[model samples]
Target: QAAVLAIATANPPNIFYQADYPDFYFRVTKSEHMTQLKDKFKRMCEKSMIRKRHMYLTEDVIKENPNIGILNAPSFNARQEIMVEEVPKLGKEAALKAIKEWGQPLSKLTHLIFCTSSGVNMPSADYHLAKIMGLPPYVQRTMIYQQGCFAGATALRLAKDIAENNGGHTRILIVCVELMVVCFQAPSDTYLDLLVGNAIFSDGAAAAIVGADLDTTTERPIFNIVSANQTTIPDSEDGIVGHIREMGMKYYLSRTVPQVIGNNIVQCCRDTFWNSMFYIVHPGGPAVLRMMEEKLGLSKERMRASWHVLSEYGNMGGPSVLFILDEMRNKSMEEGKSTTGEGLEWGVMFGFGPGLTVETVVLRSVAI
Candidate 1:
């Protein structure tokens, strides 16, 4: 049984208070004169339910790269340049943390799977991270790019396959890094979706160690990976859309996405009785989490980890779910629960992204 043996997360140093970001955004983008637009952004920030988000974009960085702060500017190269440098560093930071928690030497890592939709690179972050981390020369490397929010789940699905087939020596390091600095744009009345994206999406990275046949005394599994499944809602191709452009990345979230997910969540999570399992849901936003709770007839506590992560870190693309898993187990342990799944045996980690894609990983947590 392949399982997540360890989990950890990392974020850029600059933290933006949601309460203050609207004014700061308008200021940094040189759009303070658009008082009405600024006011709307303020309102959105308040309603966002996110207290703060960590971003790599500092005033100095934005000041240096003026094109990125301006609306619809030709800034793709500059944006890609930032991702090229920072992606590996952020991933390395989280990877090291997870490695420490996994209590294994670098020599023991057999594979690395790096995932990100936030960056575009040639050799990719996986190669860069491996080179910088100095993993064994023969360690296999896999890279997943532009998979959107489902990329983390996608990586885990891949990790499960590799770990199970590669025998007891298999140790897969999965790292997902998302940097929204590349996608940041100035406030524009014409592109409201960009405004919505700016409101929530932020920078983050998460790393996990996954493998099978752990040594009971030396290694412990967190959530055992039961099965991985994915499906897309019909006619929902436009539900969530993103494109790399001259002006960094343009992204859109259709208003109907919540309704679409609410309608199809049951089918995607058909592996177990929804009401009978613990929930590890991607906290795309407060509204999405709320809708899921109501639609599934779940108590508020069922999605507490999701809400906590959203409020603390906003949305960090695919890696946010890993943060939730970390929080879930930590909270359970503090509360003296018997298992990581809030003492429940079975659970599902539900991740959503573009393609209106839905990722469901059936999970079973061990008893304490």
Candidate 2:
């Protein structure tokens, strides 16, 4: 069953962080300390494995968008829970709307996949989205949650599985959206939120379509999901964790995260696709990207997509990888080029999250 699956469509959340100079304070905190508070934030960031930023505000300046909301950690805010509780509901509404909008292009899809990490409501985004998109009552669905920034690549894995396992008439739609800011701890004079939260977490979403079509000549499809791997490091329980609390959703971070990636990622990549070409890894942050680059032995230009995403959208959790992939596609189109050869277009798609786990997917671009 050597079938091909193409990304038919993709949509990202319309929100962005507002803080200006997201990289300034980031470089400084990691480099120099301007004040006592800045030094404390620098310490917190280093300990938390967080990327620092100058400022972070939602792009939704009007605040009129109902799907957007906010929350924070206790040291950050005492009443964060009150704000977080409303997020899932708003997210549900926004997701439903977003999926419906996507339905125009995916009216015949055979599967639905949900990707997220902000808050957990029983129904899950999959169920609500199926109903909201008015998909068939029996349309198949898969849910991948709490995978963090890597959720994008994981969703593609699921899509590939469904397409290969259930052949003809199969069109899979993957949705990723995160109100990561809800996990946003309150405003701090000299801590994580003030230093980075103000410039990192942002509202974002992505909808992608993948499936098989007998007619390959019309659309210029270029990728075939080849393989995947999920590696979890033992004895690193503090690496990353996200949970809901009375106040809101609070996430845990261990400074060892980027270190872990820097150490084991290359070996994992080597083991996953011995001679893959190119790459499409996540742009989790400057440190994380740097670690992965060094570990995988990849040059700076090869991972340009990762940096592009970070500079444009901030840390959008799961939707980030897809955003970078979209950029890759755009570049391919502009240059009138395509992925070719054994180690040319083929590459790895990877990201990290709460588990201190790395989710990797392999894709090879082909000619139409």
Top candidate, metric lDDT: 1
Cα lDDT, model 2, residue 248: 54
Per-model TM-score on C-alpha atoms: 0.97, 0.74
For residues 214-237, what per-residue lDDT tens digits would candidate 1 score against the true structure?
988778998999998888777888
Candidate 2, residue 259: Cα displacement in angstroms equals: 1.6
Q: Candidate 1, 179: how far from true, in Å?
A: 0.6
What is the alpha-carbon lDDT of model 2 when measured against the actual structure? Answer: 0.57
Output the lDDT of residue 332, model 2.
66
In model 2, which runs have C-alpha deviations exceeding 4 angstroms?
Answer: 1-35, 38-105, 187-199, 217-220, 274-276, 340-343
lDDT tens per residue, model 2, 13-94: 3432233233333332242334555455545444332232212223342143222222231322322232234333343444
Candidate 1: list runs displaced more than 4 Å. Answer: none
Q: After superposition on all CA atoms, how large is the RMSD of candidate 1?
A: 1.2
